[PDB]
């Protein structure tokens, strides 16, 4: 935000507290609205300064009114506390009234408060603060009291005694008001007259409370906390010569409270805080003589001092981050007012915290103490070699302890120390350590994994550049790397990294740190990021990357550590790729940079790894992936390894990786397979090539024969691997034997009686098939080399053979995965020809493809219904050039404007069903869209079915009146019933759709005619479908369609009544009861269905007969009902 925009709303809400205080119905909503409006300025409370003066005047005028009830004054105290916690009490109470006349009234209010009223605690809190504001008056309390002996006997209590009693009573409550009392302790006991009459008493009571309180009970702890807070406030806001005569007695009681051994972290912090205020009471404040000459504002000793320093040093080694910071602040404050020689004695102790590297807490405390000492300029030049050295280790503290890493606090404290160094020393006495400090912060600002550490390092670098100006290229590294640019880690590791390394002052150390730390990280993501950084920084330093870093990595690739080996292999591959890219831009080979030494090691990475069976196990999977990536990079960089055993070894490893993918974690599987096919595509295009556009006959006969003989394996993972290994083959190696590979994948994407559950095989088969069509391209008269007209028809047939592939296996429609891949294969086929030989795109095949796509664009699966719509839009709008035969391409364009297509969420049913239903108007896609709408309407999701029914009802309104429209759609739907009968996929959802359509009242014009062909055939279809069943959904769905079709008069009515009477005596009593209920409903709903005044007896015998009895008892009732309705009685054999 920028300013306060909700001014009128806040004013009205504040002027509404006088009509929403009695009942709480409009009291809670107002508070909620106020809190929601005030929370928006929680991070920018400075933007409320110009509004917090008039809001406090309105809030004070309500509480100051004597006719303002308790409920009304308490409401005004909650808003005040809200404003205080929003803006801040220090900045809010300062503007409150502070006159003399406001001394007696306010106090009186504090006297009429119940401490046991949790429903109005906000009143007891804020009020106290207001009192503390009325103790900043320069008069005495005796002058305001006047004459106290005005009443007989009972004397009046002075204001000082009342305030003292109130403070003593509220420093021992559990609520937030104790804290407020501490504010009054720093405003009342620090006064000139109150101190003279309420300092010995208040200090004797506090000592007694500290002496008789335990940290093992709930109350005692509260009293001790309150007393410690009061003592800290007294020693802070109090004088040194009024409080020094008591600091030895207090120190003793504090030490006696044995707090450093309590498990109360807040008591220890208060004790440490009280230990530094008492200590600063033993020494006079000093002033930094070193100011006014090192930067602008913007951009004798008592014996107790030794004990205080010892306690602070002991606290530095605490487990909590709060006590460590408190002790560091105390040490800094103490050192800020000590001699120049004795102060050093403290530094020598802080260094002792860096003895053991495993104690991260000690290192953090030492770094915090060093930062606090440097911020005040209390560190001598002699301590630069010992301190700065440590800091260079603190900026790289990142150790692991199993599953949880450590060192984020250490590196954060290292940045604060570096920032403080900007003002701790002078530009002349920090010269021999500028380069080391600068590059250290540079490595932390671009290469840390935590954003906090990166931002801290950036801030430290900016401070050092602004206050010293001795950092090489400070302005450049400060303008590019800032609070915004440093936010991104990828940019810092790839973009900003190269810019910072462009200079010769950051090329060697950056690469060294990347190679000896970041590459050997404990996270794969960090290792990949470091590898990419080294790659990007390998074009600014080819000599250093090919002469000092490459050999450095060749020795680490053989280390026992797995992560180190992986990182070294990645770094070597990246360096080789960068050197090859650099040599390509100078018409020179890559062997010039990579000497014989490099060529040898690179030709020994895969061989040595296999010698130690390192490729076995989970750890061996990462070595396999690294070797695959290395082989891919070497083959893409064009290496002189043609005709060597290294190529045979690489072929073997790739073949083994795919022959054992079922032994790979499903989570990290798809990756290891797309990493082996990619490596195969580069190696077979740089080494299997005898002449331009050819290949070794011997190498082409062994590979294809081996891969086409593995597409029929019994393992599915091996089938998929070989399928993708056959879709990556180069075009020079498919020339002459393309028809064989085509016939092979066709069988790999087919479904036999034994390959019913091989859904993943067809996916990769179709993926590979289209991949080979796009490699070989289209060519006239070339069935063995490219896509001609002699092989275009078979591919289309194979692609459209997988469309009718719905597999409801244990998981569900695994077929959706095969039905998805096919949708892509066509998307890459019809398009490819459209960019070369669009004539091959037949009319019937294209129409069938467009129909299948429209059908798939209406399923019950939002994910796959969003892909189908995208594919359809990509194949309909295509105008570069457009598709030759698209049924209704003008209507489709008008219904799907290219402009309003990119903003349509097809994944959401709401923004997908209303639009896909409009395709019914096209007779070509009418059947295929109605089938989809039917299979989607009979699902189970509420939103999907609702959106489908809404679109169907909004569409059938324009054809219900038209007879021929209701005579074409009805026929199409009855053809889908004859097309999908006993399928069990379309039969169930088609019955539910028919029942819903009949209940809505759509086929009404046909009900007037007797024995309409539509119902005549629908009854036969229902008889053929519902007959012989088991599941209850089909039976219930069939009984609904029957009782809905009963409405049609004629002989169809009698046949439906007979079928209902038959189903009444189903094998399951539940089905019998359901049929009876539906018959009663359809009898009491419609009219003229029963004549001769025999309906009364029918309904009576239906409501009286118990359908939950046996069959021999209900058969007689069924026969009686049939005789009463004029229906033949079925026989019993």
């Amino acid at each position: 935000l920028e300013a306060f925009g909700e001014s009128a709303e806040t004013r009205a809400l504040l002027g509404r507290l006088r009509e929403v205080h009695g009942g709480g119905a409009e009291r809670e909503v107002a508070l909620e609205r106020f809190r929601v409006i005030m929370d928006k300025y929680q991070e920018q409370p400075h933007l409320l300064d110009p509004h917090l003066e008039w809001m406090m005047n309105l809030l004070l005028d309500i509480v100051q009114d004597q006719t303002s009830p308790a409920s009304l004054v308490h409401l005004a105290f909650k808003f005040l506390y809200i404003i205080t916690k929003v803006r801040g009490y220090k900045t809010f109470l300062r503007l409150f009234p502070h006159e003399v006349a406001d001394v007696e009234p306010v106090l009186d209010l504090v006297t009429i408060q119940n401490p046991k009223d949790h429903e109005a605690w906000e009143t007891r809190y804020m009020l106290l603060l207001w009192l503390s504001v009325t103790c900043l008056i320069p008069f005495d309390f005796s002058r305001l009291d006047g004459n106290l002996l005005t009443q007989p006997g009972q004397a009046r209590m002075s204001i000082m005694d009342r305030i003292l009693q109130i403070a003593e009573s509220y420093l021992i409550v559990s609520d937030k008001a104790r804290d407020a009392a501490a504010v009054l302790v720093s405003r009342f006991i620090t006064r000139p007259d109150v101190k003279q009459s309420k300092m010995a008493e208040f200090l004797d009571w506090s000592l007694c409370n500290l002496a008789r309180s335990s940290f093992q009970t709930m109350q005692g702890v509260i009293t001790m906390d309150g007393t410690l807070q009061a003592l800290a406030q007294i020693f802070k806001h109090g004088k040194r010569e009024d409080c020094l005569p008591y600091a030895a007695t207090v120190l003793r009681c504090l030490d006696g409270c044995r707090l450093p051994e309590s498990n109360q972290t807040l008591l220890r912090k208060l004790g440490v805080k009280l230990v530094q205020r008492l200590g600063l009471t033993f020494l006079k404040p000093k002033v930094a003589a070193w100011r006014y000459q090192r930067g602008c504002r913007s951009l004798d000793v008592p014996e107790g001092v030794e004990r205080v320093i010892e306690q602070l040093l002991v606290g530095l080694k605490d487990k909590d981050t709060v006590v460590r910071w408190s002790a560091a602040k105390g040490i800094g404050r103490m050192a800020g007012r000590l001699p120049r020689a004795l102060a050093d004695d403290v530094v020598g102790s802080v260094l002792d915290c860096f003895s053991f590297q495993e104690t991260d807490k000690a290192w953090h405390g030492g770094c915090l103490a060093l930062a606090e000492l440097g911020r005040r300029g209390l560190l001598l030049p002699s301590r630069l070699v010992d301190v700065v050295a440590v800091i260079l280790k603190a900026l790289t503290y990142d150790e692991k302890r199993g599953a949880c890493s450590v060192g984020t606090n250490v590196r954060d404290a290292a940045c604060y120390v570096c920032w403080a160094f900007a003002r701790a020393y002078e530009p002349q006495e920090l010269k021999p350590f500028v380069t080391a400090i600068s590059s250290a912060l540079v490595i932390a600002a671009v290469f840390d994994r935590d954003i906090n550490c990166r931002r801290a390092a950036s801030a430290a670098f900016q401070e050092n550049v602004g206050r010293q100006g001795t950092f090489p290229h400070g302005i450049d590294i400060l303008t590019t790397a800032d609070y915004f640019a440093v936010g991104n880690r990828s940019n810092c590791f790839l973009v900003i990294s190269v810019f910072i390394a462009g200079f010769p002052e950051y090329t060697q150390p950056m690469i060294d740190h990347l190679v000896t730390m970041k590459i050997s990280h404990w996270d794969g993501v960090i290792r990949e990021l470091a590898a990419r950084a080294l790659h990007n920084l390998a074009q600014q330093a080819p000599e250093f990357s090919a002469t000092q870093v490459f050999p450095r990595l060749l020795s680490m690739t053989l280390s026992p550590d797995l992560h180190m080996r992986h990182g070294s292999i990645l770094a070597c591959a990246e360096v080789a790729y960068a050197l090859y890219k650099l040599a390509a831009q100078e018409n020179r080979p890559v062997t010039d940079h990579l000497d014989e030494q490099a060529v040898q090691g690179l030709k020994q990475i895969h061989q040595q790894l296999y010698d130690r069976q390192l490729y076995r196990g989970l750890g061996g999977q990462l070595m396999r992936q690294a070797v695959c990536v290395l082989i891919e990079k070497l083959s893409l960089s064009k290496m002189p390894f043609r005709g060597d055993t290294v190529i045979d070894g690489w072929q073997w490893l790739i073949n083994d990786t795919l022959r054992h993918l079922h032994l790979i974690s499903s989570h990290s599987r798809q990756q290891m397979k797309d990493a082996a096919v990619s490596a195969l595509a580069a190696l077979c295009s740089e080494y299997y090539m005898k002449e331009p556009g050819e290949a070794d006959p011997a190498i082409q006969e062994e590979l294809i024969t081996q891969y086409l003989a593995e597409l029929r394996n019994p393992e599915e993972m091996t089938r998929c691997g070989f399928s993708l290994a056959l879709g990556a083959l180069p075009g020079f190696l498919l020339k002459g034997r393309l028809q064989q590979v085509l016939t092979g994948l066709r069988a790999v994407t087919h479904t036999s009686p034994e390959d019913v559950s091989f859904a993943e095989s067809r996916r990769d088969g179709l993926k590979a098939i289209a991949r080979i069509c796009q490699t070989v391209g289209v060519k006239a008269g070339a069935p063995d080399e490219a896509v001609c007209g002699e092989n275009v028809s078979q591919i289309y047939c194979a692609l459209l053979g997988c469309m009718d592939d719905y597999t409801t296996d244990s998981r569900g429609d695994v077929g959706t995965w095969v039905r998805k891949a096919a949708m892509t294969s066509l998307m890459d086929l019809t398009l490819l020809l459209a960019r070369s030989q669009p004539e091959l795109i037949e009319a019937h095949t294209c129409e069938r493809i467009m129909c299948c796509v429209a059908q798939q664009a209406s399923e019950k699966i939002d994910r796959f219904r969003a892909h189908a719509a995208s594919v359809f839009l990509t194949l309909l709008h295509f105008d570069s050039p457009p598709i030759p035969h698209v049924p209704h391409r003008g209507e489709l364009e008008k219904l799907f404007p290219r402009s309003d297509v990119a903003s349509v969420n097809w994944s959401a049913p709401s923004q997908a069903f209303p639009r896909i239903t409009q395709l019914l108007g096209l007779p070509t896609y009418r059947y295929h869209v109605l089938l989809g709408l039917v299979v989607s309407l009979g699902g189970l999701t509420e939103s999907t079915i609702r959106h489908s029914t809404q679109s169907l009802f909004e569409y059938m309104k324009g054809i219900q009146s038209d007879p021929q429209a209701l005579g074409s759609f009805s026929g199409t739907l009855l053809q889908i019933f004859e097309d999908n009968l006993l399928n069990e996929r379309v039969s169930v959802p088609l019955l539910k759709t028919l029942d819903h359509v009949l209940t809505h009242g759509c086929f009404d014009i046909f009900t007037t005619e007797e024995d309409h062909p539509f119902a005549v055939k629908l009854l036969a279809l229902c008889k053929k479908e519902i007959k012989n069943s088991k599941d209850i959904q089909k039976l219930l769905s069939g009984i609904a369609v029957f009782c809905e079709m009963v409405q049609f008069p004629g002989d169809v009515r009698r046949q439906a009544l007979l079928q209902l009477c038959l189903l009444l005596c189903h094998r399951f009593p539940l089905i019998r009861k359901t049929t009876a209920s539906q018959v009663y409903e359809t009898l009491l709903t419609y009219s003229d269905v029963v004549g001769a005044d025999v309906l009364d007896e029918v309904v009576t015998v239906l409501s009286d007969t118990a359908w939950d009895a046996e069959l021999a008892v209900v058969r007689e009732q069924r026969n009686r009902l049939c005789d009463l309705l004029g229906v033949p009685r079925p026989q019993l054999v």
Partner: protein, 184 residues
């Protein structure tokens, strides 16, 4: 607390200052405070305690605390020394008899502990009067050359006409910005 929050708090505290206004009664402290803000001068009454004001000047948030210069109030001045970045000592030029008393008062304010590191701006108020002492007279009678632990600078003014008031605050801000500001 991390370094980002520490820097944020330091920047927030750097944009806040404290200017304690002191001086003998009947000197013109309330008049100067009202003229610097633009309020009315015909309706000003002696402070029965101490007044507080907050404003923004050159992006800096200035909080002025005008304390009464009465005899019974000086003893309470110690209650306004905590966190003091500037001390505006007002001196009446026409007041020539009580000068000795105004010299002892400013001399003791300099030997304090909390007021050690804080700029000093002395305003010679009521300069347009006939018997108004000059700047050199007030500088020599109060012994300003002996001051060495604080950066002082005398400068006459006149709240009745609002003259030489902006230069004083400008110099105070320039002197405050010349030194480094560190939290505690």
């Amino acid at each position: 607390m991390g370094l980002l929050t520490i820097l944020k708090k330091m920047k927030q505290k750097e944009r806040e200052l404290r200017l304690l206004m002191l001086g003998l009664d009947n000197a013109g402290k309330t008049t100067i405070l009202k003229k610097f803000n633009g309020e009315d001068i015909d309706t000003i009454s002696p402070t029965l305690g101490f007044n507080i004001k907050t404003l923004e000047h050159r992006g800096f948030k200035l909080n002025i605390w005008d304390v009464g210069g009465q005899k019974s109030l000086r003893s309470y001045w110690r209650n306004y020394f905590e966190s003091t970045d500037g001390l505006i000592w007002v001196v009446d030029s026409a007041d020539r008899q009580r000068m000795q008393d105004c010299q002892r008062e400013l001399q003791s304010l300099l030997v304090e502990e909390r007021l050690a590191g804080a700029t000093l701006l002395i305003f010679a108020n009521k300069q347009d009067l006939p018997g108004a002492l000059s700047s050199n007279a007030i500088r020599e009678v109060l012994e300003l050359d002996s001051i060495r632990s604080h950066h002082w600078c005398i400068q006459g003014c006149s709240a009745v006409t609002g003259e030489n008031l902006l230069p004083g605050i400008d110099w105070l801000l320039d002197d405050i910005s010349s030194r480094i500001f560190t939290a505690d």
